[PDB]
Design an enzyme around this catalytic site. Structure first.
Site, mmCIF file in Angstrom:
data_model
loop_
_atom_site.group_PDB
_atom_site.id
_atom_site.type_symbol
_atom_site.label_atom_id
_atom_site.label_comp_id
_atom_site.label_asym_id
_atom_site.label_seq_id
_atom_site.Cartn_x
_atom_site.Cartn_y
_atom_site.Cartn_z
ATOM 1 C CG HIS A 60 -1.954 -1.021 1.233
ATOM 2 N ND1 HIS A 60 -2.828 -1.196 0.184
ATOM 3 C CD2 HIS A 60 -2.258 -1.973 2.141
ATOM 4 C CE1 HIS A 60 -3.638 -2.205 0.454
ATOM 5 N NE2 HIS A 60 -3.318 -2.688 1.637
ATOM 6 C CG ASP B 99 -2.639 -8.435 0.846
ATOM 7 O OD1 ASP B 99 -3.688 -7.753 0.868
ATOM 8 O OD2 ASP B 99 -1.890 -8.570 1.844
ATOM 9 C CG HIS C 235 -6.502 -5.474 1.615
ATOM 10 N ND1 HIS C 235 -5.943 -6.262 2.599
ATOM 11 C CD2 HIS C 235 -7.705 -5.071 2.090
ATOM 12 C CE1 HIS C 235 -6.774 -6.327 3.628
ATOM 13 N NE2 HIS C 235 -7.852 -5.619 3.342
ATOM 14 C CG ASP D 234 -4.757 -9.944 3.501
ATOM 15 O OD1 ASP D 234 -4.422 -10.467 2.418
ATOM 16 O OD2 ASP D 234 -4.532 -8.739 3.794
ATOM 17 C CE1 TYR E 77 -2.409 -7.827 8.927
ATOM 18 C CE2 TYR E 77 -4.143 -8.149 7.292
ATOM 19 C CZ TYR E 77 -2.980 -7.525 7.704
ATOM 20 O OH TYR E 77 -2.372 -6.582 6.902
#
Ligand SMILES: O=C(NO)c1ccc(CN(Cc2cccnc2)S(=O)(=O)c2ccsc2)cc1
Ligand SMILES: [K+]
Ligand SMILES: [Zn+2]
Length: 357
Positions: free
Chosen positions: A133, A171, A173, A264, A304
């Protein structure tokens, strides 16, 4: 055929001073490392030495202002750390954060160097804080510097500037920083699969939609595979790899593959809402190993559920070590909305990739 592994416990020192239960936990990396030892995978790997990235290396992707602001946090008082962190979207900072981010990046540089000099065939990097990010000029989403993007540029700096690097970002995201860093670049093909929800899922930007194919000379070299309306899992990810990731990657013919390997999207994650299994991640890894003469570096991003990420990453390492892909669970029919996503990406990228026509 040697598999490298990089890990340094001191990346655990980055921590949240206000919320010791924040999900981006120090023990994410120690848990993955421990599971490698438990499964007797660690002794099968060559240990690559960790090191700190330099400021000059950070400048491959980041502005001098951003580097200086994050560097400054090493000597900040708590009030300064809290205020600086709150200026970004979803960042906490401690006095160890800058050094930990440098260590994550430098560990990945050493791993890429070991691959590119033929010391190891492939490698896994058990690192935190994450990177994808992070933008040229800002931190975001638990990320300070864009480790994967920096590793692509580092690889180019020790080989040739036009070295073809594929970054596959699984990932859950969208890697907004990685997309933006390479958006006008044809030397780095960025492929992200991510929960999108019509732009409502973090990082909450329509930049993650399938119609963002790249800009300038990078047109066709940005592949977003966005998922909407459904608990995606192994069937959807296997279908996306079969129809999109692998055909495009084969045509691009990378000389190095980096995986922005967040876990994740895994079954059990408290944030992702998806159900990719450890065996699923193993099959994805094994497919990528057919590229770039096997030169694959797996870089930890998010993820996570400590148990889920430990099982998932350790199985990826098992694949890099040459073990046979484990059997998958029964694959339900592809969720109808996943079919729509794949076909939308196919329509958007068929102009640029003859292998999709
Ligand atoms: O893994 C990551 N990137 O790769 C990653 C994960 C979490 C965040 C921040 N969060 C927002 C969020 C919402 C829904 C889905 N995902 C992320 S949050 O922790 O849940 C949160 C909870 C109360 S306030 C803020 C940023 C980045
Ligand atoms: K690109
Ligand atoms: Zn993530």
């Amino acid at each position: 055929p040697i598999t490298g592994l990089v890990y340094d416990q001191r990346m655990m020192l980055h921590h949240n001073m206000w919320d010791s239960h924040h999900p981006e936990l120090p023990q994410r990396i120690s848990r993955i490392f421990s599971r490698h030892e438990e499964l007797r995978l660690l002794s099968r790997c060559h240990r690559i030495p960790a090191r700190l990235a330099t400021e000059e290396e950070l400048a491959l992707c980041h502005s001098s202002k951003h580097i200086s602001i994050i560097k400054s946090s090493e000597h900040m008082k708590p009030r300064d750390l809290n205020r600086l962190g709150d200026e970004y979207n979803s960042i906490f900072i401690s006095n160890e954060s800058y050094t930990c981010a440098l260590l994550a990046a430098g560990s990945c540089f050493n791993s890429a160097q070991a691959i590119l000099t033929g010391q190891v065939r492939n490698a896994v990097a058990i690192v935190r804080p994450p990177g994808h990010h992070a933008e040229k000029d800002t931190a975001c989403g638990f990320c300070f510097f864009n480790t994967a993007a920096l590793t692509a540029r580092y690889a180019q700096s020790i080989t040739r500037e036009s070295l073809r690097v594929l970054i596959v970002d699984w990932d859950v995201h969208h890697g907004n920083g990685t997309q933006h860093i390479f958006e006008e670049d044809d030397s780095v093909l960025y492929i992200s699969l991510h929960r999108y929800e019509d732009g409502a899922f973090f990082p909450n930007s329509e930049d993650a939609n399938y119609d963002k194919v790249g800009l300038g000379k990078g047109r066709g070299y940005n592949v977003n595979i966005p998922w909407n309306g459904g608990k995606m899992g192994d069937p959807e990810y296997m279908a996306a790899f079969h129809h999109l990731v692998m055909p495009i990657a084969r045509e691009f013919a990378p000389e190095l593959v980096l995986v922005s390997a967040g876990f994740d999207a895994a079954r059990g994650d408290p944030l992702g809402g998806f159900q990719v299994t450890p065996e699923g991640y193993a099959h994805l890894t094994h497919q990528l190993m057919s590229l770039a003469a096997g030169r694959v570096l797996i870089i930890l991003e998010g993820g996570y559920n400590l148990t889920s990420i430990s099982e998932s990453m350790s199985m990826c390492t098992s694949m890099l070590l040459g073990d046979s892909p484990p059997s998958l669970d029964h694959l339900t029919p592809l969720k109808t909305s996943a079919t729509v996503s794949i076909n939308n990406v196919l329509r958007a990228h068929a102009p640029f990739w003859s292998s999709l026509r």
